Amino acid sequence: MQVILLDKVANLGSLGDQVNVKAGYARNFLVPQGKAVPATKKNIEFFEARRAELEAKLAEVLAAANARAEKINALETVTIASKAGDEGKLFGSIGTRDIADAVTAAGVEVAKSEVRLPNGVLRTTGEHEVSFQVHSEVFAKVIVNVVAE
Amino acid sequence: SRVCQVTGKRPVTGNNRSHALNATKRRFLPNLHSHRFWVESEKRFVTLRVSAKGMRVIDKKGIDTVLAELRARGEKY
Amino acid sequence: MRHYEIVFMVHPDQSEQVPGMIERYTAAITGAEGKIHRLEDWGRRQLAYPINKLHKAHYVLMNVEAPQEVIDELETTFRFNDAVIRSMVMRTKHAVTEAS
Amino acid sequence: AVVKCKPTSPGRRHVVKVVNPELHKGKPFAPLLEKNSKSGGRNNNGRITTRHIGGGHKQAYRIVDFKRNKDGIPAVVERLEYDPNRSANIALVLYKDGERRYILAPKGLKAGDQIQSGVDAAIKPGNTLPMRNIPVGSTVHNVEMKPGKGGQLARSAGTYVQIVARDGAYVTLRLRSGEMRKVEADCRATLGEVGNAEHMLRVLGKAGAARWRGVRPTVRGTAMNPVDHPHGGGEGRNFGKHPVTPWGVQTKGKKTRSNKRTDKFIVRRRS
RNA sequence: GUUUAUUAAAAACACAGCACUGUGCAAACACGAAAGUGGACGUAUACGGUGUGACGCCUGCCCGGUGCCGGAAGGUUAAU
RNA sequence: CCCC
RNA sequence: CGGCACGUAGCGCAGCCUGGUAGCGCACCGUCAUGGGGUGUCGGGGGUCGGAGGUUCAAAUCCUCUCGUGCCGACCA
Ligand SMILES: [Mg+2]
Ligand SMILES: [Mg+2]
Ligand SMILES: [Mg+2]
Ligand SMILES: [Mg+2]
Ligand SMILES: [Mg+2]
Ligand SMILES: [Mg+2]
Ligand SMILES: [Mg+2]
Ligand SMILES: [Mg+2]
Ligand SMILES: [Mg+2]
């Protein structure tokens, strides 16, 4: 209702600004994820002293690691071969666990939460595009080659 | 028991006076729900059985204070 | 073992991979000591009316001889998957190795 | 088949017994036998809930696998059996590498058949596979509602459900009541109808024929006395009321469905 | 076959059958301030309610009234 | 359209 | 009690505002049609728009009030 921002928001905020956001939006989503903090004097002092110039600017640094993981893949192409589904569809629909292991055993540091599928799960067989996001600011693009084992 | 874990709000009786004052008996209960608050000190969640006026009370106070209150009151969280 | 001229259409989707399907279509009969007569792959042509709202179709014919217990097998094979559509079978007549 | 019992005496004049000679007449497989204690109409608090119920012959619950999660191991049908629980015949089938297990009779199985469940299986009565790996327009039984619950749908004798369409990641189904719903496609089901398709015309001809099945008499209301049922009371068979439950609610009429938590799935209700 | 133990045992009750109606399963419905439980370790060839009441020939007209199911066009209409 |  | 909606020749109705000369079936009278008839046509009477008063250059069609006649809500001498 007067909450203070921790860093850049997806929308309606930039930094250190106070907004009449909704409680449903504040208690559940913002405050526990580290994107906002209620308007009290302890928090205002904390912000104007340790955040407006130090912690926000350190949060600007991890943008470097984000842009790094954006293109860490020396191949930028991951081939998965599981099984041929009778010349047609695929047996095991590739989701998030099928890729979070092929990336960790390949070197690209990506978690089950960093993957973002455009249209649900893929159930075809063919080399298709998927978008990766290591950060709300850094969106990568890595191609996948769907093969059969 | 339908009691707010944070305010002690409990059911209280009363009446149900009609348009001709028949005055049957009737209860009054809290808008009581079971929410999963966050606690940074512990970096955890905490499930309570609280009320709407307790939802705004933790907004005001803070989830640390209320916990010391409840601990000195002798109730498990 | 009887002479047949079984023909079928194919979706443009798997139309390009029909070479990979030819040998497996025909092996079920060849191992059965069947006789192939002709392999007319008419290919991609324009349909005459919308088949499930389509606009094209890949025609292929078999011109083969085979027994019933395996010809019915290949029939149900065509029918289970969704890559073949609107098939047809002939009976008992001699082979024709011409008439493209 | 159905046999019109010979009228030797009253109690057979109208009887018909659905009898199948192909099923086992010996004893069942104990390791899949659990006791099932009758609790006629009475819950943890006594105070009978459902009327019209009573005692009957002693049964024994058979451990039946609806989930069918062996998902890739063949199974040979050892034999059949008659479970007195549902309506249907059961099929005892043992897997290649050990375990024996019970399943439902899909109306077309005979002892010695080979089957298999899973996503890399064939299309034959008794094979169980996900609705995404299914040809639409088929006819199935033992359908799930969640991906793994096991099966809650169309498992009574003679029944089946005709898949009509697949809406992407969901599946439209026509139940054997007129309704058609929309469920998730990662569910699991078995092909073919279910056996004992002639239980529909299993006539009883006798009171005991039900009074030992478990049924207990249910009494008309306009005979009861008004203290016991709205329809009660009257000098000489006088209804003069509206047909309602014992508890006031009206029957022959009012729709009671008030869920709102599932109408997202119901496409077209029954009529 | 059952019933008015202790003035009525029957033409009354129930009955297998028939029909109607409800219920998609965390069912509908009942015992419960509730958690839960029976229904059912069943899932519409299943279950609950209602009525009539083996089998056989059959089940006529009326939707004005009441109740029930559909429509939201319009009039009326509570809190705030 | 009906009607001798 | 407040709000609304009906009322046009015997009947049933548009006209029920976007104010301009009361019209359309049904009845009724008369021709005509027919070999003799029914409908069919061409016509003829029969209404002052429930009453009252305003707004109006004009009413019906607009406002008010009433008289019926229904509906929905109200109502603790
Ligand atoms: Mg009193
Ligand atoms: Mg049972
Ligand atoms: Mg009965
Ligand atoms: Mg009488
Ligand atoms: Mg009477
Ligand atoms: Mg006695
Ligand atoms: Mg409950
Ligand atoms: Mg009326
Ligand atoms: Mg209604």
Short mmCIF file of C-alpha atoms in Angstrom, two decimals, chain D residues 80-258:
data_model
loop_
_atom_site.label_atom_id
_atom_site.label_comp_id
_atom_site.label_asym_id
_atom_site.label_seq_id
_atom_site.Cartn_x
_atom_site.Cartn_y
_atom_site.Cartn_z
CA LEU D 80 -10.98 -66.40 -14.84
CA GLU D 81 -12.99 -66.02 -11.65
CA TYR D 82 -16.26 -64.66 -10.26
CA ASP D 83 -15.86 -61.77 -7.85
CA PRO D 84 -19.21 -61.32 -6.07
CA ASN D 85 -18.40 -57.67 -5.41
CA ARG D 86 -19.05 -55.68 -8.55
CA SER D 87 -20.98 -57.39 -11.33
CA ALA D 88 -18.20 -58.60 -13.53
CA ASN D 89 -15.92 -61.56 -14.04
CA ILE D 90 -12.31 -61.24 -12.97
CA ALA D 91 -9.24 -62.49 -14.82
CA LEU D 92 -6.20 -63.80 -13.01
CA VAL D 93 -3.12 -63.12 -15.15
CA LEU D 94 0.53 -63.73 -14.32
CA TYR D 95 3.48 -61.77 -15.63
CA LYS D 96 6.58 -63.11 -17.34
CA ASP D 97 8.88 -62.55 -14.37
CA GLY D 98 6.68 -63.54 -11.47
CA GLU D 99 3.75 -61.78 -9.90
CA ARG D 100 0.20 -62.90 -10.55
CA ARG D 101 -2.55 -60.32 -10.35
CA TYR D 102 -6.26 -59.81 -10.90
CA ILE D 103 -7.91 -57.61 -13.53
CA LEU D 104 -11.30 -57.03 -15.10
CA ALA D 105 -12.69 -59.17 -17.91
CA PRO D 106 -12.77 -57.13 -21.13
CA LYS D 107 -15.60 -59.14 -22.65
CA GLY D 108 -13.30 -60.78 -25.18
CA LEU D 109 -10.53 -62.52 -23.26
CA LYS D 110 -10.06 -66.26 -22.94
CA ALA D 111 -7.58 -68.11 -20.77
CA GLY D 112 -4.16 -68.32 -22.41
CA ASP D 113 -4.20 -64.85 -23.96
CA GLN D 114 -1.18 -62.57 -23.80
CA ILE D 115 -1.43 -58.85 -23.03
CA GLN D 116 0.71 -55.91 -21.97
CA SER D 117 0.18 -52.43 -20.57
CA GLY D 118 2.21 -49.28 -21.11
CA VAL D 119 2.99 -46.69 -23.77
CA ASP D 120 4.93 -49.03 -26.10
CA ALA D 121 2.19 -51.64 -26.33
CA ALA D 122 -0.29 -52.79 -28.96
CA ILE D 123 -4.00 -52.15 -29.48
CA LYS D 124 -5.88 -55.20 -28.21
CA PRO D 125 -8.64 -55.73 -25.64
CA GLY D 126 -6.99 -55.76 -22.25
CA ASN D 127 -4.00 -53.64 -23.08
CA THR D 128 -3.83 -50.43 -21.02
CA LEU D 129 -2.24 -47.33 -22.39
CA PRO D 130 -2.36 -43.51 -22.06
CA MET D 131 -5.07 -41.63 -24.06
CA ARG D 132 -2.38 -39.65 -25.85
CA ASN D 133 -1.06 -42.94 -27.22
CA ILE D 134 -4.53 -43.96 -28.36
CA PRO D 135 -6.59 -43.93 -31.53
CA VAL D 136 -9.64 -41.75 -31.06
CA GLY D 137 -13.14 -43.00 -31.72
CA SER D 138 -12.21 -46.19 -29.89
CA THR D 139 -14.17 -47.88 -27.09
CA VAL D 140 -12.59 -48.46 -23.69
CA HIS D 141 -13.17 -49.23 -20.01
CA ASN D 142 -11.56 -48.66 -16.61
CA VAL D 143 -10.78 -45.03 -17.30
CA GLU D 144 -8.84 -42.87 -14.86
CA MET D 145 -9.62 -39.28 -13.91
CA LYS D 146 -6.15 -38.31 -12.70
CA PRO D 147 -2.75 -39.41 -14.01
CA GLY D 148 -2.23 -42.30 -11.63
CA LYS D 149 -5.26 -42.60 -9.37
CA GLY D 150 -5.95 -45.98 -10.92
CA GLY D 151 -9.38 -45.94 -12.50
CA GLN D 152 -12.83 -44.86 -11.40
CA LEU D 153 -14.87 -44.99 -14.56
CA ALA D 154 -16.84 -47.52 -16.60
CA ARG D 155 -15.93 -50.73 -14.81
CA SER D 156 -19.37 -52.33 -14.41
CA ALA D 157 -20.39 -55.27 -16.56
CA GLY D 158 -21.07 -54.52 -20.20
CA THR D 159 -20.05 -50.87 -20.02
CA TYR D 160 -17.61 -48.88 -22.12
CA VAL D 161 -16.80 -45.31 -23.11
CA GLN D 162 -16.32 -44.09 -26.67
CA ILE D 163 -13.57 -41.52 -27.01
CA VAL D 164 -14.85 -38.84 -29.37
CA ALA D 165 -12.01 -36.33 -29.64
CA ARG D 166 -8.79 -34.99 -28.17
CA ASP D 167 -8.59 -31.26 -27.45
CA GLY D 168 -4.83 -30.91 -27.49
CA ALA D 169 -3.68 -31.80 -23.98
CA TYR D 170 -7.19 -32.89 -22.98
CA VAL D 171 -9.54 -35.62 -24.11
CA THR D 172 -13.29 -35.67 -24.67
CA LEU D 173 -15.19 -38.74 -23.52
CA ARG D 174 -18.73 -40.06 -23.87
CA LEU D 175 -19.82 -41.97 -20.79
CA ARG D 176 -22.47 -44.66 -20.81
CA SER D 177 -25.04 -42.28 -19.40
CA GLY D 178 -25.31 -39.57 -22.07
CA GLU D 179 -22.77 -37.24 -20.51
CA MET D 180 -19.53 -36.23 -22.17
CA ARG D 181 -16.62 -34.73 -20.28
CA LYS D 182 -13.11 -33.43 -20.84
CA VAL D 183 -10.21 -34.96 -18.91
CA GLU D 184 -6.43 -35.02 -19.09
CA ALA D 185 -4.74 -37.01 -21.84
CA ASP D 186 -1.95 -38.41 -19.65
CA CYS D 187 -4.55 -40.62 -17.99
CA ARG D 188 -4.68 -44.36 -18.58
CA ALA D 189 -7.37 -46.73 -19.82
CA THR D 190 -7.93 -50.22 -21.16
CA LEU D 191 -9.41 -51.13 -24.52
CA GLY D 192 -12.65 -52.98 -25.00
CA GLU D 193 -15.87 -53.33 -23.11
CA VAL D 194 -16.17 -55.33 -19.90
CA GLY D 195 -17.45 -58.85 -19.47
CA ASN D 196 -20.71 -60.27 -18.17
CA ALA D 197 -22.49 -58.08 -20.70
CA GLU D 198 -25.60 -60.20 -20.01
CA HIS D 199 -25.88 -59.35 -16.32
CA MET D 200 -28.50 -56.81 -17.42
CA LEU D 201 -31.08 -59.59 -17.75
CA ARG D 202 -30.08 -61.60 -14.69
CA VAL D 203 -33.56 -62.03 -13.24
CA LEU D 204 -34.12 -63.01 -9.61
CA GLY D 205 -37.72 -64.22 -9.41
CA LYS D 206 -37.47 -64.44 -5.64
CA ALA D 207 -37.17 -62.29 -2.57
CA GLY D 208 -34.37 -64.31 -1.04
CA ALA D 209 -32.57 -63.85 -4.36
CA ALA D 210 -31.90 -60.27 -3.24
CA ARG D 211 -32.43 -60.50 0.48
CA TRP D 212 -29.20 -62.49 0.46
CA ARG D 213 -27.45 -60.33 -2.15
CA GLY D 214 -27.53 -57.74 0.60
CA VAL D 215 -30.69 -55.89 -0.28
CA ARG D 216 -33.12 -55.27 2.55
CA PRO D 217 -36.75 -54.24 2.11
CA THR D 218 -37.52 -50.61 1.43
CA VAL D 219 -40.99 -49.52 2.48
CA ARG D 220 -43.40 -47.25 0.67
CA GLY D 221 -44.14 -43.96 2.37
CA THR D 222 -47.86 -43.60 1.85
CA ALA D 223 -48.09 -46.69 4.05
CA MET D 224 -45.95 -45.18 6.78
CA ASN D 225 -47.61 -42.95 9.29
CA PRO D 226 -47.09 -39.18 9.01
CA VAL D 227 -44.62 -39.15 11.92
CA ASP D 228 -42.24 -41.13 9.72
CA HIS D 229 -42.61 -39.85 6.17
CA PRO D 230 -44.42 -36.85 4.64
CA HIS D 231 -46.46 -39.23 2.50
CA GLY D 232 -47.65 -41.03 5.61
CA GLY D 233 -51.17 -41.06 6.95
CA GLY D 234 -54.52 -41.20 5.25
CA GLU D 235 -57.79 -43.10 5.54
CA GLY D 236 -57.68 -45.25 2.44
CA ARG D 237 -54.64 -44.57 0.27
CA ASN D 238 -54.61 -40.78 -0.01
CA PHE D 239 -51.42 -39.18 -1.30
CA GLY D 240 -52.55 -35.60 -1.92
CA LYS D 241 -48.94 -34.40 -1.65
CA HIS D 242 -45.86 -33.94 -3.81
CA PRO D 243 -43.38 -36.83 -4.02
CA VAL D 244 -40.49 -35.99 -1.71
CA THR D 245 -37.75 -37.78 0.15
CA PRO D 246 -38.28 -38.77 3.77
CA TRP D 247 -36.38 -35.61 4.65
CA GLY D 248 -38.44 -33.11 2.66
CA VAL D 249 -36.31 -32.82 -0.45
CA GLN D 250 -38.32 -33.36 -3.61
CA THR D 251 -37.65 -36.33 -5.85
CA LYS D 252 -38.85 -37.04 -9.39
CA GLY D 253 -37.56 -33.66 -10.35
CA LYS D 254 -35.06 -31.42 -8.63
CA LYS D 255 -31.41 -31.71 -9.66
CA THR D 256 -29.09 -31.91 -6.66
CA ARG D 257 -25.77 -31.37 -8.42
CA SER D 258 -24.24 -28.29 -6.82
#
